């Protein structure tokens, strides 16, 4: 049994599988965000610099963003933040093992900033309690 839902489904391969089966394929996704231009006049000189800087800057924004939330260094991390149930009144089995992730992000894209607006506040709070326990 060599065929297991795993990395060898290919980069972006899990985009056609259910959300639950796509969790194990999250490592093949982070690896293809920096490399690909390792090996190397105006045309294609500035363009190479512009492309390289943009790719580096884009990855930084997520690494920074995970840093503020306190999830940095953990590919799959979570916090103690509850969420307004009105966003999606669905069961775990009704989300993970019965629908693809691609159309999922479309529905909740409206509250992406709102849901982000709760993560950092609690992480700073969680630090504050640790400071209180620390002191």
């Amino acid at each position: 049994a060599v065929g297991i839902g795993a990395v060898f489904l290919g980069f972006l391969g899990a985009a056609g599988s259910t959300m639950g089966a796509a969790s194990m394929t999250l490592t093949v996704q982070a690896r293809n965000l920096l490399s690909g231009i390792v090996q190397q006049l105006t045309v294609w000189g500035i363009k190479q610099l512009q492309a390289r800087v943009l790719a580096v800057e884009r990855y930084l924004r997520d690494q920074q963003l995970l840093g503020i939330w306190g999830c940095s260094g953990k590919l799959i991390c979570c916090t103690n933040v509850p969420w307004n149930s009105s966003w999606s009144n669905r069961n775990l089995s009704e989300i993970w093992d019965n629908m693809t992730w691609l159309q999922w992000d479309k529905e909740i894209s409206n509250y992406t900033q709102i849901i982000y607006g709760l993560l950092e506040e609690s992480q700073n709070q969680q630090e504050k309690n640790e400071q209180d326990l620390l002191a």
Partner: antibody, heavy 121, light 112 residues
Framework: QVQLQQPGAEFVKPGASVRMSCKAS????????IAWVKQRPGQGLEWIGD????????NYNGKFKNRATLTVDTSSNTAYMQLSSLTSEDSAVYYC???????????????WGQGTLVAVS | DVVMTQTPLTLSVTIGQPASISCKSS???????????LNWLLQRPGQSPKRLIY???KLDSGVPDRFTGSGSGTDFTLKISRVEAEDLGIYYC?????????FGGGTRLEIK
Amino acid sequence: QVQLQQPGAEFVKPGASVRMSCKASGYTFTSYWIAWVKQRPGQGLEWIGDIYPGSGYTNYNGKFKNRATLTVDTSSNTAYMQLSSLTSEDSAVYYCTRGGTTFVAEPWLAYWGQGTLVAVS
Amino acid sequence: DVVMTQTPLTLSVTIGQPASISCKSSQSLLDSDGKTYLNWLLQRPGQSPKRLIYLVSKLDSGVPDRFTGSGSGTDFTLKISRVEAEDLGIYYCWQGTHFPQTFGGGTRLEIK
């Protein structure tokens, strides 16, 4: 019907190369695994390799130290294999067998073809 | 890796007798999902390989009544009540849980 068409027989020369094709018909080629099998008349079946007709991921047996390059074509529904540059004692018939899905994987070895006689001389 | 050996190297049988063949696995093949994907295929002499038993408890299509697959863990067996020209051949026990997907060593059924 699920059939894996294979060439009849190929006569090659030492120092040459071969294009071992394996046609896919009567099913969806983008999901099922594809693997090759050796059927030496005087020896038991041997595992040669496996090619995934999707992502293009390739796996090779430990004894082969990556002596073969595996290629597939999703447009014409075909699979190809390089040896590369085998020798006399490896003159036998290879079978391109269809595997199962990467999720379930239970139906492996569901279907076979007829093989091709590789006789380097 | 897990090797697949079969005790009968030669099995002399006459038409109308029960045939016995068995296989062994060095390590137990019980997969986490709770199944044994072992396959018993009878390779014809010169024809394309054909499976006879998959999921040894289960049996393939075109069921022959004589063939009855059984066994779990380390011991695998396949009992045939009556012998036919088709039965005369080579059987291979193929594991389907570990890497590589090794086949059986081969047990030959011949009349002497």
